[PDB]
Enzyme design. Structure first.
Site, PDB file in Angstrom:
ATOM      1  N   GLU A  10      -2.578 -10.233   1.918  1.00 38.39           N
ATOM      2  CA  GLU A  10      -1.497  -9.276   1.870  1.00 38.39           C
ATOM      3  C   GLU A  10      -0.207  -9.780   1.288  1.00 38.39           C
ATOM      4  OE1 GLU A  10      -0.994  -7.004   5.578  1.00 38.39           O
ATOM      5  OE2 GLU A  10      -3.082  -7.399   6.072  1.00 38.39           O
ATOM      6  N   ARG A  54      -4.149   6.131   9.481  1.00 38.13           N
ATOM      7  CA  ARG A  54      -4.690   5.910   8.152  1.00 38.13           C
ATOM      8  C   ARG A  54      -6.154   6.333   8.041  1.00 38.13           C
ATOM      9  NH1 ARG A  54      -3.226  -0.299   7.295  1.00 38.13           N
ATOM     10  NH2 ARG A  54      -4.498  -0.350   9.210  1.00 38.13           N
ATOM     11  N   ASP A  95     -10.980  -7.179   4.093  1.00 35.69           N
ATOM     12  CA  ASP A  95      -9.712  -7.779   4.460  1.00 35.69           C
ATOM     13  C   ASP A  95      -9.210  -8.481   3.205  1.00 35.69           C
ATOM     14  OD1 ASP A  95      -9.475  -7.194   7.318  1.00 35.69           O
ATOM     15  OD2 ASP A  95     -11.102  -8.645   7.607  1.00 35.69           O
ATOM     16  N   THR A  96      -8.133  -7.970   2.627  1.00 35.05           N
ATOM     17  CA  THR A  96      -7.560  -8.539   1.418  1.00 35.05           C
ATOM     18  C   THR A  96      -6.325  -9.344   1.777  1.00 35.05           C
ATOM     19  OG1 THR A  96      -6.078  -6.676   1.107  1.00 35.05           O
ATOM     20  CG2 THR A  96      -8.246  -6.473   0.173  1.00 35.05           C
ATOM     21  N   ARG A 118      -6.875   3.321   4.335  1.00 33.06           N
ATOM     22  CA  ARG A 118      -7.124   1.913   4.517  1.00 33.06           C
ATOM     23  C   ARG A 118      -8.551   1.762   4.039  1.00 33.06           C
ATOM     24  NH1 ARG A 118      -8.703  -2.773   4.913  1.00 33.06           N
ATOM     25  NH2 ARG A 118      -7.987  -4.224   6.553  1.00 33.06           N
ATOM     26  N   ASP A 168      -5.501  -3.467   0.130  1.00 34.55           N
ATOM     27  CA  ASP A 168      -6.384  -2.710   1.033  1.00 34.55           C
ATOM     28  C   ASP A 168      -5.893  -1.313   1.447  1.00 34.55           C
ATOM     29  OD1 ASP A 168      -4.275  -3.252   2.813  1.00 34.55           O
ATOM     30  OD2 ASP A 168      -5.392  -4.590   4.064  1.00 34.55           O
TER      31      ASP A 168
END
Length: 136
Positions: free
Chosen positions: A38, A82, A35-36, A30, A16
């Site tokens: 991690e 970000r 939502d990946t 970002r 992400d």
């Protein structure tokens, strides 16, 4: 209306997050609305499908001829500094691509940065239906 702008890959960091050269400025971006799993997640560490989501984003941006960033209509940077954007690799949205492969969930959104929320929810529903990766 939203518009795409040029950026230059510096380095992919996670599924992400990618570091780009934007307007002569090195920045961490970002990916908006996703939502990946991690690899470098604060508490959990390396989650399942983390390396996969990470390799996917990396492959997608590294093999691209043109990388473009499309800011939404709300704030353009988060509290960590970000940039918040939809990233395009040769015209394909990386954000949507991950969701479509079941390598990401559509993030909880409320703030003004929600332009492509419906489009992403459609790709996630398809991915869920096909029982891909995260949804297997």
């Amino acid at each position: 209306k939203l518009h795409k702008e040029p950026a230059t890959l510096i380095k992919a960091i996670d599924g992400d997050t990618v570091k780009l050269m934007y307007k002569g400025q090195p920045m961490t971006f970002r990916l908006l609305l996703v939502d990946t799993p991690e690899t470098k997640h604060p508490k959990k560490g390396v989650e399942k499908y983390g390396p996969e989501a990470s390799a996917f984003t990396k492959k997608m941006v590294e093999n691209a001829k043109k990388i473009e960033v499309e800011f939404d209509k709300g704030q353009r940077t988060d509290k960590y500094g970000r940039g918040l954007a939809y990233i395009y690799a040769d015209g394909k949205m990386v954000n949507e691509a991950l969701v479509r492969q079941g390598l990401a969930k559509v993030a909880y959104v409320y703030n003004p940065n929600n332009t492509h929320e419906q489009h992403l929810r459609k790709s996630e529903a398809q991915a869920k239906k096909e029982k891909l990766n995260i949804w297997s």
